[PDB]
Amino acid sequence: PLTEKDYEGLKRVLRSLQAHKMAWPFLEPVDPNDAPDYYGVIKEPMDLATMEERVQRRYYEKLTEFVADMTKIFDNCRYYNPSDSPFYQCAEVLESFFVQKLKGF
Ligand SMILES: CN(C)CCCOc1ccc(-c2cc(NCCCn3cccn3)nc(S(C)(=O)=O)n2)cc1
């Protein structure tokens, strides 16, 4: 499974996404005042602060579980927003960055 060395890598990946200029819509759980009907559209929300809590609590047993949470952030964004939205493009850019960082493992 995941070792403590693995978790050091997970935290570094998470921090690199949190510092990215296009991560700002994903840093915290969506405030419904920022996204009308968001929680009527998105049935399984996820955000980077929730992922940080899960990393710190050693919630993940496998790398696939960490990657699934991250992918949910991007999939939720592209489902909720039209493809010409700046928010949708944030997900496209940040997922490309994330997938490249994952190759470093
Ligand atoms: C005041 N607040 C606590 C903190 C300051 C503002 O923080 C945010 C965070 C996320 C959004 C936002 C929006 C949106 N779709 C657009 C909905 C309509 N809209 C257009 C512009 C603003 N709202 N999709 C998404 S996402 C998570 O699917 O990419 N995230 C917006 C603001």
Curated annotation (Swiss-Prot):
Post-translational modification: Phosphorylation enhances DNA-binding.
Subcellular location: Cytoplasm; Nucleus
Location of the Bromo domain: 1-105
Expressed in which tissues: Ubiquitously expressed, with highest levels in testis. Present in kidney, liver and brain. In the brain, highest levels are found in motor cortex (at protein level).
Role noted for this protein: Regulatory subunit of the ATP-dependent NURF-1 and NURF-5 ISWI chromatin remodeling complexes, which form ordered nucleosome arrays on chromatin and facilitate access to DNA during DNA-templated processes such as DNA replication, transcription, and repair. The NURF-1 ISWI chromatin remodeling complex has a lower ATP hydrolysis rate than the NURF-5 ISWI chromatin remodeling complex. Within the NURF-1 ISWI chromatin-remodeling complex, binds to the promoters of En1 and En2 to positively regulate their expression and promote brain development.
Annotated disorder: Neurodevelopmental disorder with dysmorphic facies and distal limb anomalies: An autosomal dominant neurodevelopmental disorder characterized by variable degrees of developmental delay, intellectual disability, speech delay, postnatal microcephaly, dysmorphic features, and mild abnormalities of the hands and feet.
Quaternary structure (record): Interacts with MAZ. Interacts with KEAP1. Component of the NURF-1 ISWI chromatin remodeling complex (also called the nucleosome-remodeling factor (NURF) complex) at least composed of SMARCA1 (isoform 2), BPTF, RBBP4 and RBBP7. Within the complex interacts with isoform 2 of SMARCA1. Component of the BPFT-SMARCA1 complex at least composed of SMARCA1 (isoform 1), BPFT, RBBP4 and RBBP7; the complex is catalytically inactive and does not remodel chromatin. Within the complex interacts with isoform 1 of SMARCA1.
Family from the record: Belongs to the PBTF family.
Domain characteristics, as noted in the entry: The second PHD-type zinc finger mediates binding to histone H3K4Me3.
Protein name from the UniProt record: Nucleosome-remodeling factor subunit BPTF
Organism: Homo sapiens
Portion of the full-length sequence here: 2927 to 3031 of 3046
